[PDB]
Amino acid sequence: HKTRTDNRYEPSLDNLAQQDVAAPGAPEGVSALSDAQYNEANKIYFERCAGCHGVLRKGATGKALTPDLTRDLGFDYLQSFITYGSPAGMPLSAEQVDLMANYLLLDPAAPPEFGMKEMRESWKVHVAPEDRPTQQENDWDLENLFSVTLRDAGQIALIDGATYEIKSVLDTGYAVHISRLSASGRYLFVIGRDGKVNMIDLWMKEPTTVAEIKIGSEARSIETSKMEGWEDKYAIAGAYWPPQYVIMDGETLEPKKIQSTRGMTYDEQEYHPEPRVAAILASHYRPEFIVNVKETGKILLVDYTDLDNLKTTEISAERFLHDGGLDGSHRYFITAANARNKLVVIDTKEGKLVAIEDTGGQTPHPGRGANFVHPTFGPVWATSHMGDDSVALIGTDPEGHPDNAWKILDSFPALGGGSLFIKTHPNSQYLYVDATLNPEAEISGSVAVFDIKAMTGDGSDPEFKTLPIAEWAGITEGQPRVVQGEFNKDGTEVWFSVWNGKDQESALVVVDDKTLELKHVIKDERLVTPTGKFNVYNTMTDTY
């Protein structure tokens, strides 16, 4: 129940917590909470507790807290245990503590479902396909555009990769989690934490939302079809609540196929009523989407060639699947079962699990990870960790380097714990590692940079250069967190977000990759809480 460096990246169900619920009746031995009391506790539960314990209280990273279990424990125990407080989220009073203890002793209702009728009611096509351009009608350099989340403003900025000019600021769902691009690079898809999806046509003279839809109450992932021949055919979104994924028309967003992720855990084979959808990727080898289902530890390969006779492969992997990426060849999916410190590898060509390996670190959090050619080991993919300062390398070349394939080849320290994103590009000799969640302001405001060319894999700890990103941005207020490297199309410049509060000063910092010197500082009154940044070309092509 204490804040760690790796227990802050747990779901916060703040959109779902805005829904009012009814107070249940209380069985003998338990006291009922009033309407107000129950809702107040429920809002606290959904915001701060459901991430680890579940909205249904069947347990996730934290153990189940169902009524039968909590009534055996008793109020006093619950009261005392909750008095300490709970692990903080991303950067309780006496009355609240009692509310939570009492709430846990009552029978929870399941939040509303969100099916086809609800999706179709939210589904709006602003510009039908026939009314859209048939060629690019603006003079922008679309492939070198960066789509940047302006988190708390419920907007995104589209920024020129070469001139750093903000080309447009568009209204979207609240706190967009990620931007994804169609395979052709024409269509930009964004998903808000509230399950709102916007689809934007980059060919319009003034790009804007051409279609929108809501796919759930809580959602974090979206992806587009990337198999050759299937460009622009489909998009897919994944939700935390309800536990489901939805395949939508790539041109209109019409919801075509909704699949529940409720099911059995892979290992103990017990029913789990809240298996959240985490990362979603798209295969380059088959016409399939790659869907991580967290609590059950299943990776789904979903064939989108026929949605009525639906072929899937449900791969037993490891529990607590979160994020991941494809290797350099784009054949193998490498993903973190973070709470179990493991990297699961799937062969997307053959449709099967190939390996599961412990990184030796605490809570691997790769993002999409970093693929590079290690001077001694050959092709490798890398991840950093939230729980410690380590960077781990896994071999990704079964054909050319069989002895190194799917083995952890090295592990070495970077700036500190609380890292979220590691980054490189084929044209760069550098490996960048952030330390976003580190409690030390100077560490959280800097990035470690390793010289891949100097790496020998002799067992020593490779040295790194420390780039003072937040210092370069010149922000005197607060303790801004630096997060997520993203390259430009040419792989010559790498951008970082200098993420401060909504009413505080933020920036983007552009680093010249060849020299590791400051290239440019992006500041604008409209640049509020900049977080994720996605270069059109690097996102459409999965170049990382």
Contacted entry of ligand DHE, its own copies, ligand HEC, none for residue 193, CB cut-off 5 to 8 Å set by kind? ligand DHE
Three-state DSSP class for residue 151: helix
Extended beta strands in 366-457, E state: 370-374, 378-384, 390-395, 408-413, 422-423, 430-434, 447-451
274 makes contact with ligand DHE (CB under 6 A) = no
- Among 242, 275, 287, 367, contact with ligand DHE (rule: CB under 6 A): 367
Provide the mask over 79-98, with x wherever binding to ligand DHE is found by CB under 6 A and - wherever it is not: -----------x--------
Q: Name the minimum Å distance from CB 271 to its own copies.
A: 5
Amino acid letter for position 358 = D
Contacted entry of its own copies, ligand HEC, ligand DHE, none for residue 88, CB cut-off 5 to 8 Å set by kind? ligand HEC
One DSSP character per residue, 462-531 reads: --EEEE-HHHHHT--SS-PEEEEEEE-TTSSEEEEEEE--TTS--EEEEEETTTTEEEEEE--TT--SEE
Contacted entry of ligand DHE, its own copies, ligand HEC, none for residue 356, CB cut-off 5 to 8 Å set by kind? none
Contacted entry of its own copies, ligand DHE, ligand HEC, none for residue 58, CB cut-off 5 to 8 Å set by kind? none
Residues 6+ apart with CB under 8 A from 211: 123, 124, 125, 126, 127, 198, 199, 252, 253
363 makes contact with ligand DHE (CB under 6 A) = no
**Subset of residues 446 to 485 that bind ligand DHE, contact rule: CB under 6 A:** 483-484
Residue 520 among known ligand-binding residues? no
Residues at the contact surface with its own copies, assessed by CB under 8 A: 22-28, 30, 32, 106-107, 109, 113, 115-117, 242, 244, 255, 257-260, 262-264, 268-271, 306, 308-316, 351-353
Scan for tokens 């290690």, then name that residue.
374
Contacted entry of its own copies, ligand DHE, ligand HEC, none for residue 149, CB cut-off 5 to 8 Å set by kind? ligand DHE
One DSSP character per residue, 176-226 reads: --EEEE-TTS-EEEEE-TTSEEEEEETTSSS--EEEEEE--SEEEEEEE--
The DSSP 8-state label assigned to residue 108 in this structure reads P
Using an 8 Å Cβ cutoff, are 278 and 238 in contact? yes
Three-state DSSP class for residue 104: helix
Nearest one of 184, 183, 186, 180 to 203, comparing CA atoms: 186
Residue 180 among known ligand-binding residues? yes
CA distance 491 to 348: 27
Amino acid letter for position 108 = P
Q: Name the minimum Å distance from CB 65 to its own copies.
A: 14
- Among 368, 374, 385, 425, contact with ligand DHE (rule: CB under 6 A): 368
Closer by beta carbon to ligand DHE, 222 or else 393:
222
Closer by beta carbon to its own copies, 57 or else 193:
57
Q: Name the minimum Å distance from CB 81 to ligand HEC.
A: 4
Closer by beta carbon to its own copies, 2 or else 117:
117
Contacted entry of ligand DHE, ligand HEC, its own copies, none for residue 357, CB cut-off 5 to 8 Å set by kind? none
Residue 71 among known ligand-binding residues? no
Closer by beta carbon to its own copies, 298 or else 330:
298
CB atoms within 10 A of CB 117: 7
Q: Name the minimum Å distance from CB 49 to ligand HEC.
A: 3
CA distance 465 to 470: 15
Q: Name the minimum Å distance from CB 119 to its own copies.
A: 8
Contacted entry of ligand DHE, ligand HEC, its own copies, none for residue 310, CB cut-off 5 to 8 Å set by kind? its own copies
- Among 62, 87, 445, 532, contact with ligand DHE (rule: CB under 6 A): 532
Closer by beta carbon to its own copies, 12 or else 296:
296
Residue 265 among known ligand-binding residues? no
Closer by beta carbon to ligand DHE, 99 or else 437:
437
Contacted entry of ligand HEC, its own copies, ligand DHE, none for residue 297, CB cut-off 5 to 8 Å set by kind? none
431 makes contact with ligand DHE (CB under 6 A) = no
- Alpha carbon separation from 305 to 229, 348, 516 (Å, rounded): 11, 16, 45
Provide the mask over 203-242, with x wherever binding to ligand DHE is found by CB under 6 A and - wherever it is not: -----------------xxxx-------------------
Q: Which residues are catalytic?
A: 49, 52-53, 90, 322, 365
CA distance 33 to 206: 53
3-state secondary structure 15-77: CHHHCCCCCCCCCCCCCCCCHHHHHHHHHHHHHHHHHHHCCCCCCCCCCCCCHHHHHHHCHHH
Closer by beta carbon to ligand DHE, 10 or else 493:
10
Q: Which residues pair with 497 in a beta bridge?
A: 483, 508
Exposed/middle/buried for 365, CB within 10 Å: 0-12, 13-18, 19+? buried
Length of the chain: 544
CB atoms within 10 A of CB 21: 17
CB atoms within 10 A of CB 87: 18
- Among 57, 58, 193, 374, contact with ligand DHE (rule: CB under 6 A): 193
Residue 186 among known ligand-binding residues? no
Closer by beta carbon to ligand DHE, 9 or else 230:
9
Contacted entry of ligand HEC, its own copies, ligand DHE, none for residue 125, CB cut-off 5 to 8 Å set by kind? none
List residues binding ligand DHE (CB under 6 A): 9-12, 90, 149, 151, 175, 177-178, 193, 220-223, 278-280, 323, 367-368, 483-484, 531-532
Q: Which residues are annotated as a binding site?
A: 1, 9, 12, 49, 52-53, 63, 77, 151, 177, 180, 193, 220, 240, 368, 484, 531
